[PDB]
Every structure is written in structure tokens, then in C-alpha cells.
């Protein structure tokens, strides 16, 4: 089997993608943030406190012929940016671009965090990292495409963002029209449940490649690109004017600017971020200020590429016995 849906961004500086998810019977349809760095299938739902519900679409479980309490079952997470959520679980039917899952741990908030509430256009996330990660106690639950695998025509998925543009998450093949070139496959580490592996350097703007090793994660549900505090200086000092605010909580530049791209290296092959995509705007309305979209990973513990680096590139997440990850420019 195969699956295909489209990938769409919140707003106008994509701070996040939605994805359509069928659950249950008939088909509730939520849309949910693709979070290759969590592990967690979870909803707004009937369960969750009312006034922490704003506009969010909501999966009802006892409407749904197929759901099933996973009795027993609670689940508790937290993200980078200091959100959180937590609930119980169900088991349900859930098909995306067409591919389905029968049993699926589909885990009801309870309660999320100020964060979510404000998001009315994510209806929850769909985790897929290692389930090794997946918060679910006492009995841990498998991912959509854990569960998926052993069906799909081969074991991938693929994440092909776009800039202020939809895009695709395919589920068992690989789109050959997608991308241009070839694809170069990198080794990856799950010893920390994510998908990990290691750069072999960057350049900023037209400057000489510096070869270096990067290690750090593929992870949709980041917005930015996190990286080294010295790669990072190395990049900002190229934009007059640009600076580390403490107040703001990260590099600001002149909104006049024009930034320039930022390569990194998979393998001998090299992927380019326009300058166009390290712009996050204002960094309040009507600001001159303008927000990057390249950061210190210092005090997070991990480097992340994020949305950022991953949406300029078709990116293979390769859940064969021995998994890798595979980028193609686009």
C-alpha cells in the first residue's frame, strides 16, 4: 500500500504544516502537524477542557463505530518550546492520503498548554520519530508509520515541504518526478528516538564550504534551524546590522536586509536554503525588526533541522531494518 497528502502551511511564514487525517468511522477529519521529531498521535477532543478549545476541530470518539478506550492507558508530553499536552487514549481507524491503520492509538487531550489553544488551525499532532519515544504508560504505543510498515511497498515516508507552498507527505514510495538529481542517503542514530545524523558542513551565501560534523535531528515539527552557536554567528555576521537579542530571544536583522542562503552538506552533496526562507518577518507588527530563521541550538542540547532547512529539499525518511535519511535538492 501507499499513502499521499498534502502538507499545508499555517500562515504566511509557515511557522507549521497541516496535514489531513482520517479518524475513526465515518471519517472524523482533523488536520495535524506532522512532527517527525515526537512520537505522539495526539487530538483536540470532546475530552479536553472547553475553555482550553479555541476553533480547533475536534475528534469524538463516541461517534466513532471503531473506537475503542485503551482502558488504562494515559499519555503526557512536552516539546522544546515548553508546550505540553496530556490525556487519555483510544484505539481507532486512521487513514491518511489514503492509507489506513486499524488500531491506532489515538491519544485524547485532556488538557494542552496556552500555545495549542492559540493555534486554532492545529487540530494535534502525528508523531513520527521512533516509537521508542511515545509517551503512552503503562503499555507504549506504536507510530501511524510503525504500524503502517509492514504493509506500505516499501518502508519510507517522505517529507517534501514547500516555501509559503503546499507540499506532500507520501507513505510507501518514493515520487521520482519530486526531486531533481539524485538522492543522497546519510547514516542515521535512533539511539535517542529521533531521526539523527550528521552534516558534513555549511556555507553562508556564495562563501567556501566548511567541512565540518554537524549532528542533528530531521524534525518537521521545528520551525527554525537550530545549530551551532558558532555557525550561526558565522551566518548573522554576513547581515549588516544583524544581532543576538536577549529580549527578543534569538538573532534579529533589519527587516531592509537581504539575507543570504545557507548551505548544508549531506555527504559529499549540498543543499541550499535561499535567503528568502531565513525570513521570519517583524517581530511584532509594524517592527522594523525582523525575525531569522537560523538559530543558536546552544542551552537546547540538540541540533535541529527544522522546517528551514528541510523544506528546500526532498527529504527520504528510510525505516528499512537499518534506517537512513536521504535528501535530494528540488
Keep these: ?28 477529519t482533523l ?13 483536540f477532543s470532546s475530552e479536553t477542557t472547553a475553555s482550553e478549545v479555541d476553533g480547533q476541530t475536534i475528534y469524538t470518539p463516541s461517534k466513532s463505530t471503531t473506537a475503542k478506550l485503551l482502558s488504562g492507558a494515559t499519555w503526557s508530553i512536552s516539546y ?21 491503520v486499524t488500531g491506532q492509538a489515538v491519544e485524547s487531550a485532556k488538557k494542552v498548554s496556552s500555545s495549542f489553544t492559540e493555534d486554532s488551525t492545529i487540530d ?17 504505543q506504536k507510530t501511524f508509520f510503525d504500524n503502517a510498515k509492514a ?18 507527505y507520501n507513505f510507501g514510495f518514493i515520487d521520482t518526478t519530486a526531486y531533481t538529481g539524485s538522492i543522497t542517503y546519510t547514516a ?23 567541512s565540518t560534523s554537524i549532528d542533528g535531528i530531521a524534525d518537521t515539527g521545528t520551525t527554525l534551524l537550530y545549530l551551532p552557536a558558532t555557525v ?15 529580549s ?15 548551505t548544508f552538506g549531506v555527504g559529499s552533496a549540498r543543499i541550499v536554503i535561499p535567503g528568502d526562507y531565513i525570513d521570519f518577518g517583524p517581530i511584532s507588527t509594524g517592527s522594523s525588526s525582523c525575525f531569522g530563521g537560523i538559530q543558536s541550538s546552544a542551552g537546547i542540547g540538540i541540533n535541529i533541522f527544522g522546517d528551514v532547512a528541510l523544506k528546500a529539499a526532498f527529504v527520504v525518511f528510510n525505516g528499512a531494518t537499518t534506517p537512513t535519511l536521504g535528501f535530494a535538492s528540488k
Design 151 to 168: 504493509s506500505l511497498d516499501s518502508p519510507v515516508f517522505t517529507a517534501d515541504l514547500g516555501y509559503h507552498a503546499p507540499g506532500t
Design 124 to 140: 494535534g499532532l502525528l508523531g513520527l520519530a521512533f516509537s521508542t519515544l511515545n509517551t503512552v504508560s503503562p503499555t507504549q
Design 80 to 100: 522544546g518550546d515548553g508546550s505540553s499536552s496530556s490525556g487519555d487514549v483510544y484505539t481507532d481507524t486512521v487513514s491518511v492520503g489514503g492509507l489506513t
Design 248 to 262: 527578543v530571544g534569538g538573532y534579529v536583522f533589519p527587516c531592509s536586509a537581504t539575507l543570504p542562503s545557507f
Design 31 to 43: 488536520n495535524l502537524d506532522f512532527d517527525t521529531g515526537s512520537s505522539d498521535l495526539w487530538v
Design 188 to 210: 542515521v542514530s535512533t539511539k535517542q528516538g529521533f531521526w539523527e545524523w550528521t552534516s558534513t558542513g555549511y556555507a553562508v551565501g556564495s562563501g567556501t564550504f566548511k
Design 1 to 28: 500500500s501507499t499513502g499521499s497528502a498534502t502538507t499545508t502551511p499555517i500562515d504566511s511564514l509557515d511557522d507549521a504544516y497541516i496535514t489531513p487525517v482520517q479518524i475513526g468511522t465515518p471519517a472524523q
Design 232 to 246: 550561526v554567528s558565522a551566518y548573522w555576521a554576513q547581515v549588516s546590522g544583524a544581532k543576538s537579542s536577549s
